[PDB]
Amino acid sequence: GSFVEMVDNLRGKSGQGYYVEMTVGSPPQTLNILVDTGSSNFAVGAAPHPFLHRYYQRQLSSTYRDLRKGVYVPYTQGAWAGELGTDLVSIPHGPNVTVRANIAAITESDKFFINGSNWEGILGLAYAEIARPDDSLEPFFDSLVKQTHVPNLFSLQLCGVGGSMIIGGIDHSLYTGSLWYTPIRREWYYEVIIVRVEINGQDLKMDCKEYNYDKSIVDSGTTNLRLPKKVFEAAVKSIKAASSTEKFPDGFWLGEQLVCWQAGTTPWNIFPVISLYLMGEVTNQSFRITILPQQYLRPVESQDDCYKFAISQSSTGTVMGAVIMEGFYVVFDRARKRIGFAVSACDEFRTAAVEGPFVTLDMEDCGYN
Numbered sequence: 001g002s003f004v005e006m007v008d009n010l011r012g013k014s015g016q017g018y019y020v021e022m023t024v025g026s027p028p029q030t031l032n033i034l035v036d037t038g039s040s041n042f043a044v045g046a047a048p049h050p051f052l053h054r055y056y057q058r059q060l061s062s063t064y065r066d067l068r069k070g071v072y073v074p075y076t077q078g079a080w081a082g083e084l085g086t087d088l089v090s091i092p093h094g095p096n097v098t099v100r101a102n103i104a105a106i107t108e109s110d111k112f113f114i115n116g117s118n119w120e121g122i123l124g125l126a127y128a129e130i131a132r133p134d135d136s137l138e139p140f141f142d143s144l145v146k147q148t149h150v151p152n153l154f155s156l157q158l159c160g161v162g163g164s165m166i167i168g169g170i171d172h173s174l175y176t177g178s179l180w181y182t183p184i185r186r187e188w189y190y191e192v193i194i195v196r197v198e199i200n201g202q203d204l205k206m207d208c209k210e211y212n213y214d215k216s217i218v219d220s221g222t223t224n225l226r227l228p229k230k231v232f233e234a235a236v237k238s239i240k241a242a243s244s245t246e247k248f249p250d251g252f253w254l255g256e257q258l259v260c261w262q263a264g265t266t267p268w269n270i271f272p273v274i275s276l277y278l279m280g281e282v283t284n285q286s287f288r289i290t291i292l293p294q295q296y297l298r299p300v301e302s303q304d305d306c307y308k309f310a311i312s313q314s315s316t317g318t319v320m321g322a323v324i325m326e327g328f329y330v331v332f333d334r335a336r337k338r339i340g341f342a343v344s345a346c347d348e349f350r351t352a353a354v355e356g357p358f359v360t361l362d363m364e365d366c367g368y369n
């Protein structure tokens with residue numbers, strides 16, 4: 001294919017995120033950068049930290065321009081503080097261009113960097129609406145599209161580690177079957193609408209507004225499938241019932257306890273498949289994505305294979321994280337305001353699937369206002 005040099009440009013450690021090499025400044029300083037479709041800032045470690053193997057040294061970059069404004073980005077699990085500036089940026093195993101982009105030089109952080117993750121910064125691929133300090137700080141992808149002829153689309157194949165980030169197009173070697181698209185509801189996070197949920201083909205039977213309360217997003221930076229409290233409770237009750245051939249402690253379903261099996265004896269067949277139906281591109285038409293227990297039971301790094309249940313509770317809406325994305329080739333078609341899913345080219349009884357079309361009425365009522 002024409003995008004062959006972008007294939008296998010991602011690396012990662014299981015549950016620690018997927019990262020791409022990015023070259024900043026002059027002379028070049030290459031760093032490993034987390035690919036994050038759930039945020040909109042490009043930021044790099046720019047001072048020593050015990051979890052960083054390398055960091056950005058602004059004084060060595062002749063093309064660095066200080067914006068003379070600080071920036072702070074806070075989350076429930078971690079945060080960072082830094083200084084704004086601009087510098088030349090290229091992605092050596094990405095598009096053949098160099099752009100001048102905003103870059104936040106992280107000088108201090110709290111529980112942000114991960115010990116042994118091998119990444120030193122973050123590439124926020126979402127929209128300006130959620131950029132810090134505000135929506136006037138142009139995100140990296142926006143700069144790329146404004147400054148070059150690279151088409152306004154990227155696609156991710158996260159292999160549950162390595163993967164591919166294809167910038168400016170779609171690589172047909174990365175998927176099988178058809179690509180099915182769901183609208184991007186609003187350009188802030190990559191917001192989508194979930195219209196039905198099934199556990200082993202059995203409808204969870206919740207009002208669909210609950211699945212998207214207060215939003216549903218596609219986020220390569222989040223490990224789990226995160227569900228709103230009411231949905232999480234019903235989903236666990238159904239998964240437990242479907243996996244009744246084996247009993248697990250209550251804490252396992254809450255991610256407080258792990259369960260380990262003798263190497264290669266994991267009874268995948270006892271756990272159910274989970275299907276999320278997404279709003280399609282035509283009136284009353286939907287499609288579904290189906291994930292296996294190999295996606296939602298995450299290995300924790302012996303003669304025993306330990307797993308963590310990777311479906312968890314959220315109070316800020318549904319988050320379709322790496323648990324969801326790992327089964328699929330995901331196209332972030334910004335130009336057409338849509339997200340595409342297809343079966344990823346990366347057991348003997350079941351496979352992840354993308355199927356359609358289905359008829360689903362009143363899907364417009366599923367969204368939060």
Ligand SMILES: CC(C)Oc1cccc(CN2CCC3(CC2)C(NC2CCCCC2)=NC(=O)N3c2cccc(F)c2)c1
Binds near residue numbers: 015016017079114319
């Ligand atoms: C691979 C993950 C586990 O590790 C990291 C580490 C850093 C950044 C990210 C990307 N990324 C950063 C933001 C994220 C998810 C993961 C988050 N997103 C929510 C924002 C509001 C809407 C709903 C989604 N809430 C958190 O506390 N996060 C977090 C999670 C872990 C650490 C952290 F500091 C923040 C991920």
